[PDB]
Amino acid sequence: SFVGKKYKLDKSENFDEYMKELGVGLVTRKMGNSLSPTVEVTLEGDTYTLTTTSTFKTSAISFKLGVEFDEETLDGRNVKSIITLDGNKLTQEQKGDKPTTIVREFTDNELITTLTIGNVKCVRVYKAV
């Protein structure tokens, strides 16, 4: 029910800290802090695509819910990941040596994304385009 809906970043807290903990370099991180990306989840048959788009790059990652897969991280590692759905909450869990949780809650015609890495909690709100 959130499939095909596009949201653009409106509010952000602690993303710089999240990227810093994740190991993103100074320039990329500062560039990343200023962008206002869009997010859209689409579905084709059995396969979902989570597409995050900035003016610089589109990360379009395709996956089957509840099937472990290898995903690239912002700091350039390749780590086991799995994405699951529970109502209106899409959850991504990454293993490896910088484990993260990303919870994407599609409510009230918006998207609330909560990222966890170490003791860092980042909240990013995207409003409907």
> Which residues lie across from 49 on neighbouring strands?
42, 62
> Superfamily assignment of 1-129 in CATH?
Calycin beta-barrel core domain (2.40.128.20)
Closest CA to 92 of 117, 118, 127: 117
Q: How far apart are CA 27 and CA 112, in angstroms?
A: 26
Q: How far apart are CA 66 and CA 24, in angstroms?
A: 28
Reduce the DSSP state of residue 24 to 3 states and report it. coil
Sign for the CA dihedral angle at 105, 42, 118, 68 comes to positive
Asked if residue 38 lies in contact with residue 10, where contact means CB atoms within 8 angstroms, the answer is no
Tokens 């989570």 sit on residue: 50
DSSP per residue, 92-123 = EEE-SSS-EEEEEEEETTEEEEEEEETTEEEE
Domain boundaries, the chain: 1-129
What is the 8-class DSSP label of residue 22?
Answer: H
Please state, as a whole number, how many other Cβ atoms lie within 10 Å of the Cβ of residue 61: 15
Q: How far apart are CA 98 and CA 117, in angstroms?
A: 7
Element (DSSP H or E) covering residue 72: strand 69-72
Amino acid 119 reads N
